[PDB]
């Protein structure tokens, strides 16, 4: 049944949100982000509601295509996120490794734009598969 | 069989900057791609291995965190210390590497680069 | 990662002998393996693969084998060329380091 598809796609879009999440924090704060190994990391079930040590996120779909990516040491950086594969979302390339805040063109807003435009072929994605 | 081939095997100064290059042989970036591994001088010492974990993905120990920023291309796939403080401990050899697949279709072809030097002398 | 050993190689007694090379592995993840070889003055190559569902091995002179915590390559028809040899994996299902590679031991091929 679709359900483990929607379940799939709610991984993707989970994490993309946490992203969106983490980015809005950076706007509102007026701080520059690192994206890199030394930044935020997506591996923690936290991010999708299970507590710590709880063995739901065995089987979850959020762990599942997250440690199933092929950047993964076990860590995932928001890069090794935005860098890796595979995802029905597909992925970016060329994404440099810190990015500033500044008054003019301010780049975690043209970072923001690029996140959100790939994004939205997953919403599209999700809009068909929460309504089948 | 698809070709690696590096540039710049020359000269820096210590404490100053670098950019090496590949230039990989119809190279198209994919679900495998390249990544830079570091020969230190005649024994290989154990923390050496797999900079850079994905085409641009810095990746390493504290000793160089942060130095390794690469650029991109589909063939120049750049390592890269462009204002980042070159020391005595990374005069070494900096290979190209891609990740091979074997089955006799595509990707099974000979992964390692012709191994660029860096010397560092004032 | 997993950090590793590699032992014991001597030179051969000929061509086309049979050398036995062993290694130890400090942490796990199973039977996720390849062997590098490093010809002196050239880039590095690959000889084995196939993870913990041991699906079938490697063409020619190649072998190795592998249980608890050890991992070992067999060559059955030992050549000229044959003359340093490493241990690696990272977690997927092929490519790259362990951070460290196993540090090889010399081999070489006598007259």
């Known amino acids: 049944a679709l359900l483990d598809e929607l379940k799939a796609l709610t991984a993707e879009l989970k994490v993309y949100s946490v992203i969106q999440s983490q980015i809005n924090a950076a706007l509102s704060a007026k701080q520059g982000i690192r994206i890199d190994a030394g930044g935020i990391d997506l591996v923690d079930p936290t991010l999708y509601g299970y507590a710590v040590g709880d063995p739901r996120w065995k089987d979850s779909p959020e762990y599942a295509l997250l440690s199933n990516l092929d950047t993964f040491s076990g860590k995932l950086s928001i890069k090794d996120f935005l860098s890796g594969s595979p995802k029905q979302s597909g992925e970016l390339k060329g994404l440099k490794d810190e990015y500033p805040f500044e008054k003019d063109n301010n780049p975690v807003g043209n970072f923001a734009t690029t996140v959100s435009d790939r994004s939205r072929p997953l919403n599209d994605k999700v809009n068909e598969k929460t309504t089948l | 069989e698809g070709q690696l081939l590096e540039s710049g095997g020359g000269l820096a100064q210590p404490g100053g900057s670098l950019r090496l290059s590949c230039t990989a042989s119809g190279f198209t970036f994919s679900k495998n791609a390249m990544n830079w591994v570091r020969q230190a001088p005649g024994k290989r010492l154990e923390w050496v291995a797999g900079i850079i974990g994905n085409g641009s993905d810095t990746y390493y120990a504290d000793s160089v965190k942060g130095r390794f920023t690469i650029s991109r291309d589909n063939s120049k796939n750049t390592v890269s210390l462009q204002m980042n403080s070159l020391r005595a401990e990374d005069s070494a050899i900096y290979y190209c590497?891609?990740?091979?697949?074997?089955?006799?279709?595509?990707?099974?072809?000979?992964?390692w680069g012709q191994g660029t030097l860096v010397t560092v002398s004032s | 990662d997993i950090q590793l050993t590699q032992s014991p190689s001597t030179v051969s007694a000929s061509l086309g002998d049979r050398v036995t090379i062993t290694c130890r592995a400090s942490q796990d993840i199973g039977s996720w393996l390849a062997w590098y070889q490093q010809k002196p003055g050239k880039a590095p190559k690959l000889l084995i693969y196939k993870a913990s569902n041991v699906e079938s091995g490697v063409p020619s002179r190649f072998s190795g084998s592998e249980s608890g915590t050890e991992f070992t390559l067999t060559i059955s028809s030992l050549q000229p060329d044959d003359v340093a040899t490493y241990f690696c994996?990272?977690?997927?299902?092929?490519?790259?380091?362990?951070?460290?590679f196993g540090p090889g031991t010399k081999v070489d091929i006598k007259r």
């Open positions: 994996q990272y977690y997927n299902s092929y490519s790259h380091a362990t951070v460290t």
């Open positions: 590497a891609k990740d091979r697949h074997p089955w006799r279709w595509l990707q099974l072809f000979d992964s």
